[PDB]
Symmetry: D3
Subunit: 233 residues, 6 copies
């Protein structure tokens, strides 16, 4: 076992979809998987194993923030032998290159965290996803007719930012959106030789203040779920 | 409502106990409170309001890590008008002065996070609790005959540490244990002029290699919980 | 001996009151102690041993700035076996919560120094006083009818600040006043397992530009001296 | 004209290959291009324009180190309207996954430079290439039967390193090799909204202690050069 | 008057010798100057004005550490119109090129302080003396037959060091000795457009373990003192 | 050999003049040296050995930026046994104390590079030239009737600065001009126990926007060349 997961070793398939919100994980298990079994529930952070088009797939919640994400991803890789980790979530757009309902593939994750300096010699770690996984996402999106937006995201320790004046500067350097875990997902997978990728759905635009209707939010997140499950099968 | 709490304004009493684990919050509501009502459940992060010896008290989960804690504490203060926040968490002992299941009161919370440098001019913010709450904790512990251990804690972005060499230095500087939220609780309550304190029970021990099960991390710490409820009565 | 103190080992009592100004130390020895003996005078930095209400008490000057304070405190603890160190001084108020003649108890000391990053793994050390000593100060102040103001102070390397625009931000985070040694006193005592506390008297308000009359400055500092000597006896 | 390029505006095609060594640039012009013309030679840093299979392609030297690279890339983009920049450099292998003369495509460029902290709010900029160019490189390599190694590189300010202990950690985090310009190329192209990619051939090997001669660093990498020209056709 | 000097404006000559120890300043006044008058004594930090071979020269103590030194130097320049400041201090040798009682002239002062990063855009300020004063020191030493050692010093916030491993690296980079004020003297005089130089005599030796008594640190360095007075005549 | 120099060991004289621009090195060899032999040309970075007034002197190009300069200087010292390195170049004035055509002697080199923090314990290295060499430059300039301007320079990683608002602050702290290599030259020579000095010619004033005519630029650089060759003979 671990302190944060009470699944049996072997309960997880080697491919795992992750979301910060464990109720979104539950929703995916119930709506999209066949024969879905809840396999962990410590701290109400739910994980499941089921089948998608006959393919075994696991789902796991990771909470909010780099430190929370790093706990679960570390345990999934080191204890539960998970090999491929696809994070899907929402993000707040900061770039004119993206709009509401877009799906972003993060080919880099910048951060205001100290975690990668602590990991990496007090230097600048370029936190990046597995290239083959990003290729698979691109080819699957084209097959599904999804216009995948590709660029960096900014992973913040702050949901309520003290640096909103800086969003334009991040957009200048090709940061399409802000979220709070990708840099930790990527650095952990890099450390532990696992394949990881982050996709995020634009439900809010932090510049133009636009926001999706609650029904639209379900629809756009559903399209992201289908993309994720298709690239893992 | 906030993006992470779906309570109505006014559902929270001005005094609130916090745990990272919403199931420890649920345990406390069911075991120790009268007329307890679940008031929020976004992302499965439960919160409750109820009575202890006729006094209204709220409970709220804050998830794992400074970024998660800061989100919930910020919303509790600014939207739900919470005035006193008492974290009753778990921690890993690094000092030979403390043992498994000891209760520590954090007179300061050091950190490897960048959040306080971002908050505070890139200088050293010494994150500290409210002194009146600390005095109340000390006096209540004396009244109840509880041996309260008092010192700093170190709040890390890492549970699985890359600086295991460094725990002895931490302990030398009177850090009794490591956990992952106190510095964020303290800095947020400082920012927002609210009263906060962190108590934690030792669930893991660097020196003895003891570690509690997930069930024990919920159920083994009634002495902490009773201390907290008695402080807020 | 040491390079900076020429007292005999054993000349110091285990409890020592400190001030930056050695002439203030001399004043205390002459006005408040019985049988006071000058025991060190290297670099004109005077220290004394005498009796207060039959209690042996030492006094020692520590100069200005964290680096100066750290030299004397290190020597007092390691060579002269001093166990409890109470620093009293003036400070410049930056918070609307305090006014001229207030006495502040510093339960944390933030800093713009690099000293604690050098001491503490390049992380954020929360520099804090000994809790039991702060309890003793609080109980003694209540016995004497002193309205003790409690909060953080900011210990600066700069008397003539280049960051005056930032005072409001420090006051927001519960820094009541600025001085130049507390963070070094606290970190040194933490390193060396000694008990330390800092009190400071508000003789100037850096925001409202108010300032005490020279006679008022003597009176307010006298009240602080009495509080200190009473808590050590 | 610019202080470092004496070409006429319009002399550069929109697609440009880059090497740190202007004599590798000269070699490519003479060996692989039709109707090649030298278009700039300030500071002996040569650049050319010519044709490959009827398609116009430019070549430009960028010197050694991030500061040198940033100068030339900034001018190529802002003054000479270059749109796509493909570095084909050399690097020192630090990972057992790669061997001498292997071709690496840098999916990210970590660094010990301060340039990106200066650019990017003192946070961590994850310096990354254009994804479309990366896909083009991958697909062209597959078409040509070239075994393209894919991972991060570490861009250092040092060729003769003071952190030789640290190469193993770099390699653990999937840094295949060390070189000295990719992070600057990537950050400058991000700043200026241009498409950039870095390929490098292994000219030195940490583990085997192999190292090529200066002549071999010009002449030994035709497979890299052909990959690059085929990508831009 | 200033908070730390109670001289009248005009009491200081434009040329001033500085020591950290006010009793070394007093020693110089009594032993080497004609008609010496004590002009300031706040906090027992003495200063004098007198004549050497008919030329007016002032002396002033600056206490221990960069923060203390910066206070006195700032006031001497801005209020008392001092133009040339010559520190004649003590230092701990870390290089085998120097021996006990050697006189070092600090061509640069490296530091572990944050003060210069705070002053200077968070970049590296290379703190250096006035070149004309350095030339004067060199030429006067030659004239007097004094073997002046020339190199960098390292100005630390610590006398009792936590980086004893690091002294050999310091010495490799031509740091002959460690002391605690030169970088602050140099940075303050740079800020304020005044001429400053630091000479120091070796009072402690890392390699031989030699260390002088407090009395010897006042009385053993007449050769330094005579060099300084001859330079300012 | 080395990767970046193809001269024979022994081809270099122990005294070497350096410039960033290898065509300026060529110009010096052709116009001012007797019997000049080109001895290296890797990457078109030319170096020469010849005679000046019967004195053997070498010349070597070092490219732009600290990282480039550090490669060549390291190789010159460690492989080719060069003992004295005099860098001459142009610089952009930022101080009212200097004007067009002035020659500056840099007695310190500040920087925005991370290189000296990486070299030097994450502290502040005061990067300084060899004092005897600076003496020789001063005495030679006086003999030649040159009004040598003496002060710090600022060595930047950025030719196209993002911090132009800060030039006035650097001028305040006695930075007379900006260039891009001196801090690296100085730190490398300090590490490796070689004698180094940087002179620079003011061809542009970055404040007043003044600029020398192309013919004046040749004349002023010629005067600097003569000063350099005279101090090495
Ligand atoms: Cl960071 C952290 N680490 C824990 O245990 C692991 C550990 C134990 C000893 C030394 C260092 C780390 C915790 N147990 C409860 N909260 C915790 N937070
Ligand atoms: Cl920084 C750098 N170092 C190289 O080789 C030296 C080396 C080899 C192995 C480990 C570390 C350093 C390079 N070869 C081509 N470009 C290079 N850039
Ligand atoms: Cl920081 C300092 N340390 C001294 O001696 C202790 C020492 C000796 C050798 C290596 C390191 C530290 C001094 N003696 C006079 N001024 C001094 N400043
Ligand atoms: Mg989400
Ligand atoms: Mg005082
Ligand atoms: Mg030049």
């Amino acid at each position: 076992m671990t302190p944060h997961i009470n699944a049996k070793i072997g309960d997880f398939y080697p491919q795992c979809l992750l979301c910060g919100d464990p109720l979104r994980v539950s929703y995916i298990a119930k709506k999209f998987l066949q024969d879905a079994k809840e396999i962990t529930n410590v701290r109400n952070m739910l994980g499941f194993s089921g089948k998608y088009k006959g393919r075994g797939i696991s789902l796991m919640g990771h909470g909010m923030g780099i430190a929370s994400c790093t706990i679960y991803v570390t345990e999934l890789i080191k204890t539960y032998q998970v090999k491929e980790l696809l994070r899907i979530g929402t993000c707040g757009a900061i770039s004119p290159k993206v709009g509401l309902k877009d799906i972003i593939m993060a080919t880099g994750a910048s951060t205001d965290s100290k975690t990668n300096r602590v990991r990496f010699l007090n230097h600048d770690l370029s936190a990046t996803p597995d290239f083959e996984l990003s290729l698979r996402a691109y080819q699957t999106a084209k097959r599904l007719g999804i216009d995948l937006k590709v660029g960096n995201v900014f992973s913040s320790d702050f949901f309520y930012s003290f640096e909103t004046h800086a969003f334009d500067l991040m957009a200048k350097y090709n940061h399409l959106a802000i979220e709070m875990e990708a840099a930790g997902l990527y650095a952990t997978a890099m450390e532990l030789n696992a394949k990881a990728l982050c996709l995020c759905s634009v439900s809010d635009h932090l510049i133009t203040k636009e926001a999706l209707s609650p029904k639209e939010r379900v629809e756009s997140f559903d399209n992201m779920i289908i993309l994720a499950l298709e690239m893992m099968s």
